Amino acid sequence: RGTKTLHYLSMITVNGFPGIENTEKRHFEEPRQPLLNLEKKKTAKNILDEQGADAVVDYVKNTKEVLLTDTTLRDAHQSLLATRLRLQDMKGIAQAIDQGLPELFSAEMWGGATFDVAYRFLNESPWYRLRKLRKLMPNTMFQMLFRGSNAVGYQNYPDNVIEEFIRVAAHEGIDVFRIFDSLNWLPQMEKSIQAVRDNGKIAEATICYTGDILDPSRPKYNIQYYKDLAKELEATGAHILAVKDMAGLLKPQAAYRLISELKDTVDLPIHLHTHDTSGNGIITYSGATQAGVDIIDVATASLAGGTSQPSMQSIYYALEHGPRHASINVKNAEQIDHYWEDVRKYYAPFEAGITSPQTEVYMHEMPGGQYTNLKSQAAAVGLGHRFDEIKQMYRKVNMMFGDIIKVTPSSKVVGDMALFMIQNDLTEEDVYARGNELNFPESVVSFFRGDLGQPVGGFPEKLQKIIVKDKAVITDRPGLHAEKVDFETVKADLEQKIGYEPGDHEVISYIMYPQVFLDYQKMQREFGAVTLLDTPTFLHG
């Protein structure tokens, strides 16, 4: 093992880290360990382990205070540090988060972009990160982000693959599955919700919020649409209804109105997830708190603000003397935030830059992760100079598509469309006129083929016929048309490829990311377990 780490250290010392500018390994002090005042409490993890998910739901309903879910381990560093937060920095504070904050409903540490990014860039297994965090944080609930029928991948998978991933993730320590569909289509979420319920975990059915419910000019995503969606989601037997504000679009008055109306229609607890990109995340959470929201999604203050979640400490102080208080130990939270600031100093090459409240997100409606990725893609193609026109094309392409919900992977479709549209300098009338001649991006064609599901109100018919010139268009779940996957054959082929008998997690990771898992295995052969390295040594040597 020593030769592998020596090889990796020599490689990084000489050739530098791939994708970042080469710099010297500047000296870092040891990150500040917290000084916690421990109080023993029965957490929602204990309730789930003892009496199951329904007891957890009843505990949430009987909690007068508003519960907090920490998104520091997944979404805060997905938005701010390009999902590059390593397990080595997480494990120095995992026990402190488990002990100093037992009032947390759950910690979101998995799903989203973490699964792909860990394998692709951090060269560490997300399953290994899950196992180490589960050992380190035994009395907290683990929340993951689940993309409906795509799970952690960006495309549709057959139903047995999704069920097996849910089973393996539940066995390895995931306690809450937040299941969302990119276009808010129920059939893509039904089977995942049923599988999560069968595995005994909490199923968070999710509504992606877009538009403005208080704006009569945009009537498609009105309050009645969300009420009907919440009713049919409650019909599926999900434990907690989740409201995912992917781009910070939910305004405070709209937040109060939406949470009140959803509280009237369903008896499910409501989980609200929003981003502070508009700068109104704190007041939105407060307005939802007055409306009666149950759980809200917060990050530590050092990894909060901008495209990330609002800070949990500021959410505590904003609700300190109101009718409803947040459930947190604020002193322990600040003590943990000191460590988070010190380890955020490690990830300087992955920082986005100077951040300000960005109220332009109300028009272009672009999520922050997709915002950073779109900026990087425009820089890679040399279009980063005209990113204001990129924003305008993004908004106009979204309106051209029929005002779709823009969350991954549907936001990636709109981003690719806008990049291609500015790439060869045409308008939407030019799309309707010349569109038979050009070759549209593959993601747009796949979306108009129905591989992402069915959008609300259906596709624009003439534009769809332009986009797919001769390809077949399905109108049902893409999982029905998926190729059958047999796990014994895949396991045998993986054993041939990686040279040893793989576990269920390795098989289900090979199915979702075939090339990425094999590249990760090759990197493990060449360099060993680089997750054990500290972050400045991992980046610079």
| Binding residues for Mg ion (CB under 5 A) | 63, 294
> CB burial class (10 A; 0-12, 13-18, 19+) of residue 35?
exposed
Residue closest to Mn ion, measured at CB:
75
By CB under 5 A, the count of residues binding Mn ion is 1
The distance in angstroms from the start CA to the end CA of the chain is 17
Q: Residue with the closest Cβ to Mg ion?
A: 294
CA distances from 55 to 26, 150, 178 (A): 50, 29, 18
Instruction: Find the helix packing angle between 514-527 and 504-512, rounded to 10°.
Output: 120
When the beta carbons of 320 and 430 are compared against Mg ion, the nearer one is 320
Residue 70's binding partner out of Mg ion, Mn ion, none, with CB under 5 to 8 Å set by partner kind: none
Q: Which does 46 bind (CB under 5 to 8 A by kind): Mg ion, Mn ion, none?
A: none
Least distance (Å) between residue 297 CB and Mg ion: 15
* 108 touches Mn ion by CB under 5 A: no
Q: Is 234 helix (H, G, I), strand (E, B) or coil?
A: helix
Q: Which is nearer to Mn ion, 182 or 521 (CB)?
A: 182
The residue type of 264 is D
Q: Select 43 or 69, whichever has its Cβ closest to Mn ion.
A: 69
DSSP string, 361-389: HHHH---HHHHHHHHHHHHHHT-GGGHHH
Residue type, 306: G
Closer residue to Mg ion in complex, CB, 69/150 = 69
What is the token pair recorded at 228?
Answer: 């009907």
CB closer to Mn ion, 158 vs 369: 369
Using CA atoms in the order 409, 415, 416, 419, what is the torsion angle rounded to 10 degrees?
-170
Output 117 or 168, the one with its CB closest to Mn ion.
117
Q: Give which of Mg ion, Mn ion, none residue 63 binds (C-beta under 5 to 8 Å, depending on kind).
A: Mg ion
Task: Report, in Å, the least distance between residue 273 CB and Mn ion.
Answer: 6
Two tokens, residue 24: 């010297």
Q: Which segments of 365-513 does DSSP mark as H helices, in order?
A: 368-381, 387-401, 410-423, 428-434, 442-448, 461-467, 487-498, 504-512
Q: Outline where 199-248 has alpha helix (H).
A: 223-235
In the list Mn ion, Mg ion, none, the entry touching 337 (Cβ below 5 to 8 angstroms by class) is: none
Site string for Mn ion, 33-72 (x = CB under 5 A): ----------------------------------------
Of the two residues 79 and 521, which places its CB atom closer to Mn ion in the complex? Answer: 79
Indicate which single residue of 12, 60, 74, 75 sits in contact with Mn ion (rule: CB under 5 A): 75
Q: Which does 75 bind (CB under 5 to 8 A by kind): Mn ion, Mg ion, none?
A: Mn ion
For residue 401, give the 3-state DSSP assignment.
helix
CA-nearest of 454, 467, 374, 368 to 412 is: 374
At closest approach, how far in Å is the CB of 295 from Mg ion?
Answer: 8
Tell me the closest approach of the beta carbon of residue 40 to Mn ion, in angstroms.
32
Q: Which does 290 bind (CB under 5 to 8 A by kind): Mg ion, Mn ion, none?
A: none
Q: To the nearest whole angstrom, how small is the minimum distance from the Cβ of residue 322 to Mg ion?
A: 15
Q: Which does 297 bind (CB under 5 to 8 A by kind): Mn ion, Mg ion, none?
A: none
Least CB distance to Mg ion at residue 63 (A): 4
Selection from Mg ion, Mn ion, none that 294 binds (CB < 5 to 8 A by kind) is Mg ion
Structure tokens, 292:
């009666």
Decide if 205 contacts 189 (C-beta within 8 A). Answer: yes
Report the DSSP pairing between strands 295-298 and 67-70.
parallel
Nearer to Mn ion, 74 or 344 (CB): 74
CB of 250 to Mg ion, least distance (A): 19
Q: Whose Cβ is closer to Mg ion: residue 57's or residue 195's?
A: 57
| Footprint of Mn ion (CB under 5 A) | 75
